[PDB]
């Protein structure tokens, strides 16, 4: 009648223990402040108007990228069979993004890139002309 | 020299030639033109009769293909699925998309070190053979995995 | 020696609790770090509940604590 | 010694000195391997790139303390409810910081070397392992300080207790002499640093609801 | 190391497993889910026929249970008593309260190192079995001692 | 050693007896220490004596504390 309790995993390292303990506190500090920001300034608009979908924007991709924005967006547009467009001057300090997802449509990849770009760049899609457009901000 | 690496890790030319030869005798078509590589798989060796459900024994073949794909260095892979004409255009477009989604997920679960995997399903739009008498036994219902070797 | 006896043996040291985990899912009775809740009630040394021993070296045998009290108890007799 | 009826070394330090170094180096290697295995999760967690302000300005680092008492001496005490301090000031950057300058531990392979030799070499090994774990824990505290100070800045800017940095840019035209030209000179300079405001009448509160059923 | 303690004192894993096994063969139910522990005792092994008077021989069983409880470290213990339906609701509420008071007092007299012991008696309100044919011989007249192991 | 073992055995009774925590004043101020003497005589020298009935003295003055005192700083 040997007694056992269900989760029996691989052994753990105390470095990973300490890293996890720091990460939990980082996560809930982040959660509380995101609550405060959402309450203080409620958003009103959504980037589905600037990036609508189309046929053959529904092919799918899984991506793990940590570089500048232009090469990844060119690869996405070329896979979607669209023309690629750049407006404005690229800044001297590069615009870096970091995407690590699994299995979503190309339109959603583009919208997440658009959200992570922030105040530095923007993405627009014209489906009647089949054009993906990246425009840089007039800053510096 | 003793502390720099002397080759890309886990990779050997004899192993590449051996596995390419074994795959060609088994029946999976492996071709290379320039630096582009194509692996073409018949759908009967992977799926059931037009359902997106793998057999249990075909995971050994997917494991073998993943062990082949770990030998190179690459940036993007494309997986595209094609089928044969059964009911409408929509049913096989959905079928090929589901098949490509499942296969690319298992390949991503194994450790292929790619940055992007694109998946699409073209239905029965692009046949490579005018003999269309089989069902899923037809030679033009297949999945193709294409990539470019980088440097 | 034998911490997880009549269990499967030692799995790992949980440093969040300071305890060993056995190979069944039971916490062990053995400690594995010094920041574990041990129930210490008896401590050695002198000049406790003062500042500790003021570290000058003395010609005589008096031991003086850091707050001016003199330990006659740890002091050598004549 | 004990009851009334009971009343009736150089290899030592050389063993500790070779054990401590070997334990420290070995544990440092294992720590680096564990850090390199989990490299994408730490980049996702410590995302400095998405905290950067408008003109590529790193936000200031702020610190918070609550429910404060000081007993200054006998006859005087001072108490306060919260206190806020600017630990580090904002500045221009060209690249964002990364976790590797904080967490990476340094390895150099030590190749510079019997009755009781074994036990003390083993004890020195334990001492070196414990020292390495302590060093890693202080590094973790330091990275948590930088990220938490910046995150706290974002919350207080939202709740209107600090001022944002103010930046001015000047546009020169085509400048230079006949030996050298620069086509579009622009000079950027931040003229007001962020700072806490002591007028409490403009402060803005945040009340978060929950609604169900 | 020679002057720090190396374990919590008077406690051993083999002793815990041994006593838990012996108690389960004797008939007292000992269960553990997560870190919560439950000891369930039938009322016939402790009391007379619905009176709050212990037999003289059941103090060995209470001593055995106290020796089990000294193996852990804990903050609160709860003792709750339940009985079967005899006369009114009040008579068995009083009976279960008296039974729990006596049992928790003897446990507190022995050296269980807890900070709080809570006692309550619920009467015959919460049955664990729909077969209600016995009297005090019924399986749903019992006392339960529950706690959480702390760290 | 034997004295310390006897002190540690009886730790709850001494905390109940020397209850400094329930003597503390309003703003966490320790009360002053007062001393009493009764029926006092002093023979200063030959030719002079001084007598008194009671005398009271402030041995220690009140001050702020953060923690109350405990018996362990005295008896250990």
Automatic annotation (TrEMBL), chain A:
This is DotD. Keywords: Lipoprotein, Signal. PROSITE patterns: PROKAR_LIPOPROTEIN (PS51257). It holds the Pfam family DotD. The gene is dotD. It comes from the Bacteria.
From TrEMBL, chains B, E:
One of its GO terms (cellular component) is membrane. Keywords: Membrane. Signal peptide: none annotated. Residues 34-151 form the OmpA-like domain. The keyword DNA repair does not apply. The keyword Membrane applies. This is LphA (DotK). The chain holds residues 38 to 188 of 189 of the full protein.
From TrEMBL, chain D:
It comes from the Bacteria. Keywords: Signal. This is DotC. The lineage of its organism: Bacteria, Pseudomonadati, Pseudomonadota, Gammaproteobacteria, Legionellales.
